[PDB]
C-alpha cells in the first residue's frame, strides 16, 4: 500500500518543506493568507509546534497546545500533535492527521451545536 500524498508530494518530503514551498500546493484563499504574513499570535503557535515535534521522544505523548488562531491553515509541522482550538467557549481538542492538509483549523470545530426539535 502506498504512502500518504498531498497534491503529488509524499509525507517524507512534505514534512521537510519550508512554509514558503508548501504555499505552492494549497488552495487560492489559503495561499493569500500566507502571502500576507503571519500575526504575532500565529508565530508563537508555530514555534511551539516546531519545538514540540523536536522535543517529544519515546512513547509518551507531548502536552496539548492551545490556540485562538482559528483561520490558520494546517501545516505539515503540526502532524501527529494534539492541539486545542478555541470554539468561542472552550479549547476543543483534536489530533492533526495527514488528511487534514489544505483546510483551516476552523473547518474541524463547531461553534454552534446541531439542532434537533
Partner 1 sequence: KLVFNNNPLPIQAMIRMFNTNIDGKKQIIKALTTIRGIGDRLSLAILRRAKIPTDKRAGELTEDELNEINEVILNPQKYDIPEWMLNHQNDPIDGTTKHLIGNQIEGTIRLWNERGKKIGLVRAFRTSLGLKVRGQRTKSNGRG
Partner 2 sequence: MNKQMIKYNADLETTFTVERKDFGRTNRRCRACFAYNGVIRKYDLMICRRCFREYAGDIGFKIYD
52 and 65 in contact (C-beta within 8 Å)? Answer: yes
Among 72, 113, 70, which residue's Cα sits nearest to residue 91? 70
28 binds partner 2 (CB under 8 A): no
Q: What does the binding site for RNA look like in residue numbers (CB under 7 A)?
A: 27-33, 36, 39, 70-71, 102, 104, 106
Beta carbon nearer to RNA, 53 or 103: 103
- Point out which span in 5-13, 14-22, 56-64, 102-110 binds partner 2 (CB under 8 A): 14-22
Tell me the closest approach of the beta carbon of residue 112 to partner 2, in angstroms.
24
Among 114, 58, 113, 61, which residue's Cα sits nearest to residue 83? 61
Amino acid at each position: 500500500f502506498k504512502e500518504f500524498s498531498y497534491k503529488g508530494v509524499n509525507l517524507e518530503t512534505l514534512t521537510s518543506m519550508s512554509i514558503s514551498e508548501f504555499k505552492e500546493l494549497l488552495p487560492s484563499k489559503l495561499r493569500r493568507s500566507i502571502n500576507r504574513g503571519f500575526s504575532a499570535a500565529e508565530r508563537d503557535f508555530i514555534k511551539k509546534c516546531i519545538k514540540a515535534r523536536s522535543e517529544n521522544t519515546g512513547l509518551e505523548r507531548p502536552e496539548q497546545i492551545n490556540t485562538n488562531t482559528r483561520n490558520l491553515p494546517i501545516l505539515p509541522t503540526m502532524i501527529g500533535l494534539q492541539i486545542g482550538v478555541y470554539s468561542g467557549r472552550d479549547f476543543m481538542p483534536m489530533v492533526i492527521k495527514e488528511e487534514m492538509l489544505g483546510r483551516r483549523l476552523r473547518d474541524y470545530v463547531e461553534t454552534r451545536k446541531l439542532c434537533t426539535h
